[PDB]
Structures are given as C-alpha cells and as structure tokens.
C-alpha cells in the first residue's frame, strides 16, 4: 500500500501519458 | 504509507504539471 | 512495499525514459 | 516505506528534473 497522495500522483501520471499518446496518434 | 522520498517526488511531479498547464494557458 | 498501481506506474515511467533516450541516441 | 523499485524511480525522476533545469539555465 502507498500514501493516498502517491496513488493519486501515479494515476495522474498514467492518464497524462495516455492523453499524450492519443494526441499524437 | 510511502517512503518520505516518494511522497516528496509525487508532490514535485504534480506541481510541475500544474505550473506547465498554467504556463500554456 | 507499494500499491500495485504505483509499482506499475513507476515501471512505465522508467521504460518511457529509456525509450526516449534510445530514440535520441 | 515503499517498494525499492518505486524509490529508485522517484530518485531518477527528481534527478531528471534537476538536470533539465540546469540545462535550460
Ligand atoms: Ca500521509
Ligand atoms: Ca527510507
Ligand atoms: Ca507502504
Ligand atoms: Ca490498493
Ligand atoms: Ca517487491
Ligand atoms: Cl509507495
């Protein structure tokens, strides 16, 4: 388990990557 | 809970994203 | 130990960096 | 505490930011 702040940041990071990929495709 | 180093890095990462967004807006 | 989601995000982040480096080299 | 992999990724992430800043300055 992780700090809820870290879980939040990890999710935001992944969604950022996904949106970036979709933008370029 | 997380290592204090990881908590620090997560906060820095989020603030980086926020500042980037504000810069572009 | 960390949340499996955070472990996943950390791995993705590192592989992203590696691929970026290889792309530029 | 965190998974050693996550600690490693957090350190790499921060050093990446620092080097980027120094490069631009
Ligand atoms: Ca806490
Ligand atoms: Ca420690
Ligand atoms: Ca933990
Ligand atoms: Ca969980
Ligand atoms: Ca492990
Ligand atoms: Cl963690």
Curated annotation (Swiss-Prot), chains A, B, C, D:
Site positions (Essential for channel activity, possibly by being protonated during channel activation, and by forming the channel gate and the selective filter): 16
Keyword annotations? Disulfide bond, Glycoprotein, Host cell membrane, Host membrane, Host-virus interaction, Hydrogen ion transport, Inhibition of host autophagy by virus, Ion channel, Ion transport, Lipoprotein, Membrane, Palmitate, Phosphoprotein, Signal-anchor, Transmembrane, Transmembrane helix, Transport, Viral ion channel, Virion
Give the site residues for Seems to be involved in pH gating. Answer: 20
Entry keyword Phosphoprotein: yes
**Subcellular location(s) per record:** Virion membrane; Host apical cell membrane
The answer on whether this UniProt entry bears the keyword Transmembrane helix reads yes
GO molecular function terms attached to this record: monoatomic ion channel activity; proton transmembrane transporter activity
Biological processes annotated in GO: protein complex oligomerization; symbiont genome entry into host cell via pore formation in plasma membrane; symbiont-mediated suppression of host autophagy
Q: Name one GO cellular component term.
A: virion membrane
Instruction: Classify the source by domain of life.
Output: Viruses
- Where do transmembrane segments lie in this chain? 2-22
Main subcellular localisation: virion
Subunit structure, interactors included: Homotetramer; composed of two disulfide-linked dimers held together by non-covalent interactions. May interact with matrix protein 1.
Q: Quote the function comment for this protein.
A: Forms a proton-selective ion channel that is necessary for the efficient release of the viral genome during virus entry. After attaching to the cell surface, the virion enters the cell by endocytosis. Acidification of the endosome triggers M2 ion channel activity.
Q: Which family does the entry's similarity section mention?
A: Belongs to the influenza viruses matrix protein M2 family.
Q: What else is known?
A: When the channel is activated, one or more imidazole moieties of His-16 probably become bi-protonated.
Q: Any idea what this protein is called?
A: Matrix protein 2
Q: Which organism is it from?
A: Influenza A virus (strain A/Hickox/1940 H1N1)
Q: Taxonomy-wise, where does this protein's organism fall, top ranks first?
A: Viruses, Riboviria, Orthornavirae, Negarnaviricota, Polyploviricotina
Q: Which residues of the full protein are shown?
A: 22 to 46 of 97
